[PDB]
Amino acid sequence: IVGGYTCGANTVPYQVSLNSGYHFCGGSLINSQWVVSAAHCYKSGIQVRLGEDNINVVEGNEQFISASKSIVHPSYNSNTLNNDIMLIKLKSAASLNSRVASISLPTSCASAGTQCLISGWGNTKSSGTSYPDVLKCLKAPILSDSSCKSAYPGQITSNMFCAGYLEGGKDSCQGDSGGPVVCSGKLQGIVSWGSGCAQKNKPGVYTKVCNYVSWIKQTIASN
Numbered sequence: 001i002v003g004g005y006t007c008g009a010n011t012v013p014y015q016v017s018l019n020s021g022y023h024f025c026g027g028s029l030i031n032s033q034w035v036v037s038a039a040h041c042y043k044s045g046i047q048v049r050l051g052e053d054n055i056n057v058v059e060g061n062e063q064f065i066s067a068s069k070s071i072v073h074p075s076y077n078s079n080t081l082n083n084d085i086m087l088i089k090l091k092s093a094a095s096l097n098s099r100v101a102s103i104s105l106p107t108s109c110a111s112a113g114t115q116c117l118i119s120g121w122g123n124t125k126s127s128g129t130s131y132p133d134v135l136k137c138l139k140a141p142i143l144s145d146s147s148c149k150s151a152y153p154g155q156i157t158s159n160m161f162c163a164g165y166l167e168g169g170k171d172s173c174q175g176d177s178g179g180p181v182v183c184s185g186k187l188q189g190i191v192s193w194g195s196g197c198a199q200k201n202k203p204g205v206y207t208k209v210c211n212y213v214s215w216i217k218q219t220i221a222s223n
């Protein structure tokens with residue numbers, strides 16, 4: 001997160017870190033046994049880390065649970081990033097509490113102008129590299145489909161939306177991938193892609209979660 005703020009420990013209780021020896025992507029807890037992330041975050045050997053603030057210190061609210069199964073969206077295209085979504089099932093159920101909590105899935109899509117909270121442990125510089133230890137947060141609005149398409153000609157599908165600031169300076173970044181975009185208490189987006197970070201006229205691009213709720217619910221019901 002570039003241009004954001006320190007969230008505060010466990011104030012984003014559905015935020016997870018995906019760990020394969022090191023943090024490499026975010027995710028969102030959607031029930032006691034399932035996590036939603038970005039397909040481009042797929043790898044084997046995932047440990048899900050719940051309850052994290054400082055990802056380099058054991059502070060007392062963590063739950064570390066191995067993935068038992070990963071399911072990349074059937075139609076994921078790694079070249080275009082269309083359908084950049086994946087589900088991860090935990091080997092055991094998380095113990096849900098005030099600091100480790102699921103986020104509601106949307107019943108309807110969000111609209112341009114709605115404010116949302118984006119979070120993660122990704123890079124905090126746009127012309128630099130600095131990775132935070134504690135969770136960072138950014139409040140940002142959804143942008144219109146037309147301004148999204150104008151920012152990224154020929155690249156925005158119906159499964160993508162833009163959010164952030166055309167002026168630059170405030171965005172998600174490398175290492176935030178897979179993490180949440182939550183709007184009015186609903187998971188509406190997944191950190192997916194963008195040209196650099198926090199660059200003028202190059203807002204973040206997010207997977208549009210509302211398009212996937214049918215797939216998510218049926219997948220959970222059969223696995």
Ligand SMILES: [Ca+2]
Pocket residue numbers: 052053054055056057058059062
């Ligand atoms: Ca920790």
